[PDB]
Amino acid sequence: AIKKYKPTSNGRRGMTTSDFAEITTDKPEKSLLAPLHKKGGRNNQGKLTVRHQGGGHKRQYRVIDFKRDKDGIPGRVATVEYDPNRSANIALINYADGEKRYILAPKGIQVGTEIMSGPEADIKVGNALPLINIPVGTVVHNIELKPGKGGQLVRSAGTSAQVLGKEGKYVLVRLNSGEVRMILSACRASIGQVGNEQHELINIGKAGRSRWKGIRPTVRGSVMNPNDHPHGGGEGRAPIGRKSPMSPWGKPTLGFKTRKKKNKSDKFIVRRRKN
Amino acid sequence: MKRTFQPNNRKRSKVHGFRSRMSSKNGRLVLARRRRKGRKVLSA
RNA sequence: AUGAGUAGCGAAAGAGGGGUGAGAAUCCCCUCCACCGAAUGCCUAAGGUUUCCUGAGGAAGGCUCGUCCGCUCAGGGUUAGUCGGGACCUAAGCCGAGGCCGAAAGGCGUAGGCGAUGGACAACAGGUUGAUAUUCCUGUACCACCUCCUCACCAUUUGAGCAAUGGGGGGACGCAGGAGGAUAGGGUAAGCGCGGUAUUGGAUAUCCGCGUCCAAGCAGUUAGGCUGGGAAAUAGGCAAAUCCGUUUCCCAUAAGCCUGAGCUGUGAUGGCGAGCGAAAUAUAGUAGCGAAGUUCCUGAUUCCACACUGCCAAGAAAAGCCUCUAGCGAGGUGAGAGGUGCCCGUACCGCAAACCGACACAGGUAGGCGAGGAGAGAAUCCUAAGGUGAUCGAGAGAACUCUCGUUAAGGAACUCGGCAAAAUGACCCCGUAACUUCGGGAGAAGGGGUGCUCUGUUAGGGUGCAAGCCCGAGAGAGCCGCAGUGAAUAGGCCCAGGCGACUGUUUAGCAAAAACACAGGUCUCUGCGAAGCCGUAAGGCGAAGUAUAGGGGCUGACGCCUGCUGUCGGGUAAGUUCCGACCCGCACGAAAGGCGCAACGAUCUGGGCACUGUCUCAACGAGAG
RNA sequence: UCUACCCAUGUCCAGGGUGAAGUUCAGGUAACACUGAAUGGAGGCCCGAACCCACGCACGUUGAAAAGUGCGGGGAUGAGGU
């Protein structure tokens, strides 16, 4: 599902793109679209707080259901579309009553399949089951807080997690990163892996494409003079203060931990991967 | 060769106007200072 | 005061005859001549503020003069139910009842509002004054509201009306490409008015000018789209719903539905129209009179219309105006008469002497139209409609300075350096290397022909009964110049090396290069809902993101590899540039080398052909001082 | 109200081109090759006006101008101009 462009001209040379061979539509649902404006990385004070962010194409937000509350009433897949504000693809489900919602498309879904959310729902794929399933199985979209907040972990293209043991009111679950954590058994999740696993292998090609997505150039901290960045600013001498650039805000950033101590959340963690 | 002054009535009134100066306490201080001296044109 | 009656008087074509006056190179009239014409034309923003029209003026301002003026003094001049804004709607942002923080002053923010650069929305043709005109006048219209008094059909839950609070629609929306249809516009053949020429010749295939028309309200049309209709039943749409979704059947397979550029009649026995041209009106010219008013070719950068097809960067916002459902609760359709159906702007300049630059300043200033010939073209030259003669002049033709044109014989001998100037450049035909990442290099390099007449309304096509246009190939013949893209506009090529792909900064105004940054890629380290970041906090950015976000060092890309001072030769008659050998070292788990293919590279360094006033060595000529 | 970056909403870019691609249709090879046609023609492509820059030389330097003019030059569907 990846297409390679011919070396007709420099700039298009090496640019790989997707085939979008999953989207069966081209129009959104005028009932689930909502406005969304750009920000440029500026606070409520009007000052820049996040850099290398500004510009791009316009985009409309599609409201997705990360709570899978409708329990019992069946629904059918209608179309798989494209969402510009996420990495995965979305699916329009037509419930028996006639509600219409959007759900994160699970890997290997196809028009016609009838989904089912609930404690008595079957395993299959896309079925939202509360944390009371087998001690194994690829699971996605998990709720950390007691059910009601909505899925937060494992929600992007190709991501997948696994349920291990069950400790009383908690459930041992390995997270994508590689860490293991105890999740309140009261929580709910789905079944399957998020799709479009070819997203990790696409060459942007030219500066322009990056700008189209909303990324601004980045200047090496070393080249900027010591006023703006710790160490730097040379014209004809050997590196002036350089070889120890440090972060632009005067803080260490190499083999330096950040996870705050007294986390009050060190009781549910067990393994440590990317903290 | 653009010069530094480009006239516009809306911007002038929105920035230097009376109704704008009467919003903060510093603008009211400016108005009081102008009144004390005796200027004919208060604000703009 | 001195410099000193010195420098300057701010891009441009005028000449004569009248006039007026105390006074005229500079003001009015006439006739010839010259300049712009994808503007120096017209209409109209921002901004200006009376600069606009008429009668007087000659103190100051106009780089001179002045009888003149954007100057001075007196009077005048701007008309809206339909054009633009408000008694309509929302974006970014701003304000913010209660509320949350904070020594005070204050910071932030919910309900709710304000805010066009966008969305909704009813009128067209002609005439007129010294100054306004979709506004005044004459004709034909449309829109919302009322019943003063009416009129005709048609009256109470026997439901008229009813919207939200529901739902549809809008507002519905991106970029690029190419068909088709139709018009704005541009040029022929009938026709109507004039003329028959004193320089040779023309009553004629002779010459000049003209050849139409609104909105509305009638009818019928290219095209387009539908997702096709019909019947039942509903765990949804805060209550409700016949409305919208959903499901099950039935028939389709042509019906039905909704949008449309344009055309034909009627507005129109109307009004416009070449030219005749009254009095005297103040002799203008108006009053006034008024012919024909068709067919044929070529047409869009405009309309159908983001309608159709493709692409990923996924695309528009938002709300109201509109329809339709029910919760609520009696008069509706068509004529006649109305309200006059309110407020703000309306003069004049807006590529300029009325705006921004201290100036009547060689600079700057959103948008809509924008003809002909030759032409691919909004290029170039000459011209239409229209506008202009740009505010110091006479005469002489010295040195010198600036901007231009030629030049004997030699050509780079000049110079830090071919800096500068010269040469090439338009079409159509033939041909086109090493080296490559296979796309390129490539308009590589290099050769040949164009003018005018007759076969000739050529073959064909399109164009269209035909006629009238073309693309009109392709041929033959034959004439004549020194010259055939006869003027103006339009690549100089070729060998060897370093550095870095398109882009940005320039160090706005002494550096645009290998300067320098950026960049697609590579690698490392932190964050499981956050790490970071901004704030005293409250509040936010990250983000309506969930291994995606931070931070660091790298960096064309792509490869491979891979981590991640000799001295000599060979060139010039007389050599840095490049060599292959000398290296001196290697530093390099990354880091080097060896990888120019391309660049659209205003890059740096060597060498060839053509060409030349760069020079041996200067000489004439044109314009400004 | 100059200038740097960002947010919402509008608008501008005469003409021409060897000719790229993917794609499709046919001959063709088991299919890749190779031919034609369409595809027009996407692209930080090419030549070139309006428009935007500011590389060389000359003049100006008590300037027409407190940063200009003349002749050449670069980009010109986009990391565009306004």
Numbering used by the authors:
A (entry chain C): 2 to 276
B (entry chain d): 1 to 44
What did the study's authors say about this model?
YsxC (YihA in Escherichia coli) is a 22 kDa essential GTPase in Bacillus subtilis. Depletion of YsxC in cells leads to the accumulation of a 50S assembly intermediate known as the 44.5SYsxC particle. YsxC binds in the body of the 44.5S large ribosome assembly intermediate, occupying the site where uL2 binds and controls the timing in the folding of rRNA helices forming the binding site for uL2. Overall, these results suggest that YsxC serves as a placeholder factor for r-protein uL2 and provide the first example of the involvement of such a factor in the ribosome assembly process in bacteria.
To achieve this, we incubated the 44.5SYsxC particles at 37°C for 15 min in the presence of a 10-fold excess of YsxC in a buffer containing 2 mM GTP. Visualization and analysis of the maturation reaction using cryo-EM and image classification techniques revealed that the 44.5SYsxC particles evolved into five distinct classes after YsxC-GTP treatment. Importantly, the local resolution of the density representing uL2 in classes 2 to 5 was similar to other areas of the particle body. Analyzing the uL2 density from the four maps revealed that uL2 is bound to these classes in a single conformation, identical to that on the mature 50S subunit. From class 2 to class 5, we observed the progressive maturation of the uL1 stalk base (H74-75), CP, A, and P sites. The CP is still absent in classes 2 and 3 but becomes progressively more complete in classes 4 and 5. The A and P sites are fully immature in class 2, but they progressively show more densities for the rRNA helices comprising these sites in classes 3 to 5. Only the E site remains immature in all classes, likely because it also requires the influence of other assembly intermediates, such as RbgA and YphC. An important consequence of the correct accommodation of uL2 in classes 2 to 5 is that H62, H65, and H66 around the uL2 binding site become properly organized, adopting their mature conformation. Nevertheless, uL6, located below the bL12 stalk, became stabilized in class 5, representing the most mature particles in the dataset.
